[PDB]
């Protein structure tokens, strides 16, 4: 079967098992895929979403070590556009779930899910119940 190009963007701050499971899910959407991961810039993340603890460089270098990741766009645009899809020959956008209505209308949206409790901040909440 033909190779399907998947695009998954995010902040990927302090990458945890929840991110990794989501990337695995996107990678395995079809039998033969190329998973492109977009890593959002420090400025736009801070401005649109909130404080980021790791720089773009740190967030990107970590993602390079993940099995499911085939290609990285870093920094990636904050908003996916139709032109972006055509520029990188993206077949589907894989994201947790509006702003994706236009993708779903075109058949180009694949929902992936989060894993609760696994996150990095929750692991400190752990060691902080040693007292």
């Amino acid at each position: 079967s033909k190779n399907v190009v998947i695009y998954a963007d995010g902040v990927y701050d302090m990458l945890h098992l929840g991110h990794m499971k989501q990337l695995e899910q996107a990678k395995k959407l079809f039998e033969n895929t190329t998973l492109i991961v977009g890593v959002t810039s420090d400025n736009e993340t801070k401005l649109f979403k909130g404080q980021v603890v790791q720089t773009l460089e740190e967030r990107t270098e970590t993602l390079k070590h993940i099995r499911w990741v085939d290609e990285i766009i870093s920094p990636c645009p904050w908003v996916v556009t139709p032109e972006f899809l055509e520029k990188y020959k993206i077949d589907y956008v894989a994201h947790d779930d509006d702003i994706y209505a236009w993708l779903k209308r075109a058949g180009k949206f694949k929902a992936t899910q989060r894993t609760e409790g696994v996150s990095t901040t929750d692991l400190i909440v752990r060691i902080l119940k040693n007292y």
Copy 2:
């Protein structure tokens, strides 16, 4: 060239970029390798080394998402023995650097290096200089 079997054991608690770089180094020691990773048990780690924040299951599931990891032995023995090498057909043990004198004498030890400052605990020391 023939496939070289590399064994790298550790606790791999709260896996960070330093672990990942070390695993990449072991994986790339030769052109064609199988990297086996050993993950130490909760009891022995606690007893011999110190408190572990993630369980064996959590530490092992995370390692599964790392590109360089080909096989996992979980839990792995606390001490590498000659019998262990023969049982899994290990050619080299890759570890940060004694207790490895016997490996170095046999030509079966490959030193890998750490990365400072990248660790998970240091990233909290970060957010804790927001105040």
